[PDB]
């Protein structure tokens, strides 16, 4: 097959014809976008993939990024569904390509997907972001890259040349350049780029949105389900400088320069033994190596960069599940599990309010059981389950995207806001987890047309309809349908209005302010209280 053969700047590429129930498309899986960063390259940004002789063979996904795998529950299809599904290597810079069979002959908006994993685990080849249903679907171009995470993508020894830190958000941003370089070659168009992605991967299109060397490679920004300004997403230099030593230390090393290159004499899986152990205290949704705001990639905090910005010019879709923080308690939380009803007790919700919100002061921590406690039923086990469950939920995810979507639309940007609603009827965590973070993926990616799998009729025609929405915002910086001279369905989201849509099988429905009353605690008051 002719489309199937592609030259790039480096070279020739051989790829595969991939099936869809509504006709094929075209794929270019592993295609090396940088040079391997191993060996005296480990913790160093990435440098260009040098051109080849012959043919890449591209069909087949590459090798997943080296990274700590869960086994919480070990064979559990909710967490596996997470976990590297091919194997782990430092030689891990690889990038894939899902094109329209035939292969557009004007040239297609592009889609570039950043996976999330709390910047310390994700892959581009997890089955949950198949390329080929929204491409064949919408017909535009998606691409897709592996970025180091954990220590290997994040260990930052701020101020020096060895560990300069945000390597994982490098390997980003040199994908990025690749897509402006190469994308044509697929029938994409360089001059219509939109970032997408979910958890950290949000947050890092937040991180490209605020960093001026990646502004210049996308033009709209999709966030799911994350933020640059979440208390997760970024650490200050100390705390990195202290995670990064620690980490020395409990490998035996051994002097920036010292250092790391002992810590470059350790395997890789080594390092990811002791990846955990240096968080300081007992969490959830807290990850050891994170970006670093280091004056270089980020010139200031994402918070402060947000408020100066300026961002005519420039769309953005953000959006939250409805159970943001429900996933997470099963990962530390006392009395929650995900095989029973996790009704806790009292006792349970002020000990996991300190695991939800970790490292704040008693001060800060009584505020917060105030504001989520109902002083009418203190003590009703559900109430306290769902209320733990927003505590994290909203500190962590939807209150720092409120934050910044008001930010945004105030300073130039156009905002749409959603909420996703719809629970997987195939969902393998059980049901008081509600729709929990990261179960929108499969349906903007179409998985339920997928005839191997067991998705409703109603849910394949969702599916549709939400690729329908974010192929419109790739073309146009607009959801809505571009034909339209009515008022828009789906509304921008604006500071004073706040309006956001529902995700759901029922029709779109405007609704205001996201979650309004938490985050004006976690967003003014209790910083108040504490200041
Ligand atoms: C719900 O489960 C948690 C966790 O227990 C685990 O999951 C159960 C379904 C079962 O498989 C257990 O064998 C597991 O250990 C319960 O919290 C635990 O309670 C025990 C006392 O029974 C205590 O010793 C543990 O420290 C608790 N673990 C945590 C993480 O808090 C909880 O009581 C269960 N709720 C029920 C049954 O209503």
């Given at each position: 097959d002719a489309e199937l053969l592609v030259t790039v700047r480096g070279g020739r590429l051989r790829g595969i014809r991939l099936k869809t129930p509504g006709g094929p498309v075209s794929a270019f899986l592993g295609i090396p976008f940088a040079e391997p960063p191993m060996g005296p390259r480990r913790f160093l940004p990435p440098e260009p993939k040098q051109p080849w002789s012959g043919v890449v063979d591209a069909t087949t996904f590459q090798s997943v990024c080296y990274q700590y795998v869960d086994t919480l529950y070990p064979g559990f299809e909710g967490t596996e569904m997470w976990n590297p599904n091919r194997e782990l290597s430092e030689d891990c810079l690889y990038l894939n390509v899902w094109t329209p069979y035939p292969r557009p002959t004007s040239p297609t908006p592009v889609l570039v997907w950043i996976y999330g994993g709390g910047f310390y685990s994700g892959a581009s080849?997890?089955?949950?972001?198949?390329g080929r249903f929204l491409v064949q679907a919408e017909r535009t171009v998606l691409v897709s890259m592996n970025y180091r995470v954990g220590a290997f993508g994040f260990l930052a020894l701020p101020g020096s040349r060895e560990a300069p830190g945000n390597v994982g958000l490098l390997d980003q941003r040199l994908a990025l350049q690749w897509v402006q370089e190469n994308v044509a070659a697929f029938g994409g168009d360089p001059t219509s780029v939109t970032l997408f992605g979910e958890s950290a991967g949000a947050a890092s299109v937040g991180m490209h949105l605020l960093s001026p060397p990646s502004?210049?490679?996308?033009h709209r920004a999709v966030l799911q389900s994350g933020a640059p300004n979440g208390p997760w997403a970024t650490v200050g230099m100390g705390e990195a400088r202290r995670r990064a030593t620690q980490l020395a230390h409990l490998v035996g090393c051994p002097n920036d320069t010292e250092l790391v290159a002992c810590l470059r004499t350790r395997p890789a899986q080594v390092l990811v033994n002791h990846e955990?152990?240096?968080?300081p205290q007992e969490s959830v949704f807290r990850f050891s190596f994170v970006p670093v705001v280091?004056?270089?990639?980020?010139?200031?905090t994402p918070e402060a960069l947000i408020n100066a910005g300026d961002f005519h010019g420039l769309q953005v879709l953000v959006g939250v599940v409805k159970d943001e923080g429900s996933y997470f308690l099963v990962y530390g939380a006392p009395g929650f599990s995900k095989d029973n009803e996790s009704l806790i007790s009292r006792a349970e919700f002020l000990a996991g309010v300190r695991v939800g919100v970790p490292q704040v002061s008693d001060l800060a921590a009584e505020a917060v059981v105030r504001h989520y406690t109902d002083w009418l039923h203190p003590e009703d086990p559900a109430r306290l389950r769902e209320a733990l469950s927003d505590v994290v939920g909203d500190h962590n995810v939807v209150c720092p995207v409120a934050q910044l979507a008001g930010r945004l639309a105030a300073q130039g940007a156009r905002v749409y806001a959603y909420v996703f609603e719809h629970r997987a009827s195939?969902?393998?965590?059980?049901?008081?987890?509600?729709?929990?973070?990261?179960?929108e993926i499969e349906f903007i990616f179409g998985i339920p047309l997928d005839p191997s799998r067991n998705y409703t009729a109603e849910e394949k025609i969702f599916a549709q309809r939400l690729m329908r929405y974010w192929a419109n915002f790739a073309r146009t910086?607009?959801?809505?349908?571009?034909?339209?001279?009515?008022?828009?369905?789906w509304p921008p989201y604006t500071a004073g209005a706040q309006q956001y849509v529902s995700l759901d099988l029922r029709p779109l429905e405007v609704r205001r302010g996201l979650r309004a009353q938490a985050c004006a605690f976690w967003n003014r008051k209790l910083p108040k209280l504490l200041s």
């Open positions: 080849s997890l089955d949950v972001y198949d502004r210049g490679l996308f955990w152990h240096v968080l280091d004056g270089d990639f980020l010139s200031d195939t969902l393998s965590w059980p049901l008081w987890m509600g729709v929990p973070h990261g179960y910086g607009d959801p809505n349908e571009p034909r339209d001279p009515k008022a828009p369905q």
